[PDB]
Amino acid sequence: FDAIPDVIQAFKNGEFVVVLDDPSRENEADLIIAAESVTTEQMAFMVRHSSGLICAPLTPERTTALDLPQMVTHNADPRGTAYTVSVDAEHPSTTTGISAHDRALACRMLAAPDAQPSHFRRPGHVFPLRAVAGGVRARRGHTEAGVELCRLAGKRPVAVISEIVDDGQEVEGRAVRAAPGMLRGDECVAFARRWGLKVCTIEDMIAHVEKTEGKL
Amino acid sequence: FDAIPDVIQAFKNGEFVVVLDDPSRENEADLIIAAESVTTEQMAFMVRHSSGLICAPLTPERTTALDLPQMVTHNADPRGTAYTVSVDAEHPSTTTGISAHDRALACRMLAAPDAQPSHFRRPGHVFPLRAVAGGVRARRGHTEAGVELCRLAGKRPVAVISEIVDDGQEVEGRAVRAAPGMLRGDECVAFARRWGLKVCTIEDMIAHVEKTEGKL
Ligand SMILES: [Mn+2]
Ligand SMILES: [Mn+2]
Ligand SMILES: [Mn+2]
Ligand SMILES: [Mn+2]
């Protein structure tokens, strides 16, 4: 596992970083990147290697500034995953909203300093997620982790996250994949090494933050 | 392009079929399958080859029976894509809701004849879509197309759909994909041929339906 400071540096450089939550929690690794400059090609990569449900962690301040209400009033998710209503980019170059170009665009726009509610179409294809006010020390999830990195690296308070799945193996000529699942632990590290990314645990992320904030 | 009747047969056999909307519309091809028996391995394949935003077209009757309210009251999507609130399977085998196993499960459950509102957690990771009452002749989209196939093939009135993207090409050792996009026209047919699937146009789907119903 890389050291948090080095993860921060990569993050600040516009790179994806691989982040693992606790084993007792989701025991999942997400690809987490700053939203402000996520490129079309990077988004293509993200879509290719993840679940494809591209989310955009952001602060409460941002949800209000941008008028992104919670998808549901009585949240039935066991983790309280804070989904807002979905969105597309209101931009002349947007078409159907699902292509890597469109989704990357929506992400950058949500992060733009001049962002306004009218900049987004609801519903759409990118999923903003409301990080809790107390950040990672309060809720140990990738949503908080992405916003925390943004803060740590001095970026716009909008990240992009998605889970790294195990797409199993191709079956020549058949519309199935054998033995799929979710990438875990060591396989996540290996995944990171393969693509030149830094990889860490939210747990170490918390330890980092505690250095300045103390234990919640 | 395959003949509708043959597409129907494949569909009835639990296969994915490749469906293209009009060029003047989305000009996209979706992987469309019956939800009632979508397998874990098939879902893995679907996730791997599509946008990863796995939707589940269903009837108004089903949205009411299962208490799936529209995600938004004032739908800003230019196509009026009918998203309901998202869901996960309330099942002991569900974990985080995003794995191919979990998503496939949610799909089958939404299609179960004994399905009840309490069977699903909201919000979640599968996206039900409300087909319009008039079906394909009324709205020429993949949502209607999936529900129509269900009807045509005598299946439960719940389909699973997702767009087939162009993930561009791998870039050895780099977290990017070059020249990504959406698969179109001939490339979609080729995609279908590659995986042993039938492929058709919603336009021919409409022509099929018109044989019995006349032009809307
Ligand atoms: Mn669409
Ligand atoms: Mn997570
Ligand atoms: Mn999750
Ligand atoms: Mn479509």
Distance CA A143, CA A134 (A): 12
Contact A41 B75 (CB under 8 A): no
A211 CB burial (10 A radius; 0-12, 13-18, 19+): exposed
Nearest to A26 by CA among A151, A139, A195: A139
- Measured in Å, residue B146 CA sits from the centre of ligand 4 at 10
Is residue B146 a contact partner of residue B131, using CB atoms and an 8 Å limit? yes
Q: Among this protein's residues, is A88 annotated catalytic?
A: yes
Is position A201 annotated in a ligand binding site?
no
Please report where in the chains the tokens 């909008």 appear, as a residue: A158
Is the minimum CB–CB distance between A40 and chain B shorter than 8 Å? yes
Cβ within 8 Å of residue A108, ≥6 positions away: A35, A36, A37, A38
- Measured in Å, residue B26 CA sits from the centre of ligand 4 at 6
Is the minimum CB–CB distance between A173 and chain B shorter than 8 Å? yes
Which residues of A, range 190-209, sit inside 8 Å of B by Cβ?
194-197
Is position A26 annotated in a ligand binding site?
yes
Per CB-CB distance under 8 Å, the chain A contacts of B181 are 99-101
Identify which of B28, B44, B81 has the shortest CB distance to residue A177.
B44
Q: Choose from A11, A39, A77 for mutation: most chain B CBs within 10 A.
A: A77
- Measured in Å, residue A193 CA sits from the centre of ligand 2 at 21
Contact B168 A76 (CB under 8 A): no
Q: Choose from A53, A85, A171 for mutation: most chain B CBs within 10 A.
A: A53
Is residue A30 a contact partner of residue A148, using CB atoms and an 8 Å limit? no
Give the residue extent of every domain in chain A: 1-216
CB count in 10 Å sphere of residue A64: 12
Nearest to A177 by CA among B198, B171, B54, B38: B38
Reading the block at residue B71, the tokens are: 């995600």
Nearest CA in chain A to B49: A48
| Partners of B159 in beta bridges | B34
Nearest CA in chain A to B31: A175
User: For B58, what's the count of Cα atoms within 13 Å in the CB-facing half-sphere?
Assistant: 31
C-alpha distances in angstroms, A83 versus A74, A75, B97, B157? Answer: 12, 9, 14, 27
> B142-152 and B202-213 are packed helices; what angle lies between their axes, rounded to 10 degrees?
50
Distance CA A126, CA A57 (A): 11
Q: Among this protein's residues, is A208 annotated catalytic?
A: no
CB count in 10 Å sphere of residue A10: 20
The CATH number given to B1-216 is 3.90.870.10
- Measured in Å, residue B96 CA sits from the centre of ligand 3 at 5
Nearest CA in chain A to B122: A76
Distance CA B162, CA B32 (A): 7
Identify which of A51, A178, A197 has the shortest CB distance to residue B47.
A51
Is the minimum CB–CB distance between B119 and chain A shorter than 8 Å? no
Please report where in the chains the tokens 């394909």 appear, as a residue: B136
Is residue A85 a contact partner of residue A127, using CB atoms and an 8 Å limit? no
Distance CA A89, CA A126 (A): 9
Is position A137 annotated in a ligand binding site?
no
Distance CA A146, CA A132 (A): 12
C-alpha distances in angstroms, B88 versus A166, B9, B105, B130? Answer: 19, 30, 9, 17
Instruction: Report the catalytic residues of B.
Output: 26, 30, 55, 83, 88, 125, 142, 163
Q: What region does A211 belong to: left with phi over 0, alpha with psi -120 to 50, or beta?
A: alpha
Contact B167 A47 (CB under 8 A): yes
Is residue A146 a contact partner of residue A46, using CB atoms and an 8 Å limit? no
Residue type (1 letter), B82: A
Is the minimum CB–CB distance between A100 and chain B shorter than 8 Å? yes
* Alpha-helical regions (H) of A93-201: 100-111, 135-138, 142-152, 185-194
Q: H or E segment at A127?
A: strand A120-130
- Measured in Å, residue B132 CA sits from the centre of ligand 3 at 31
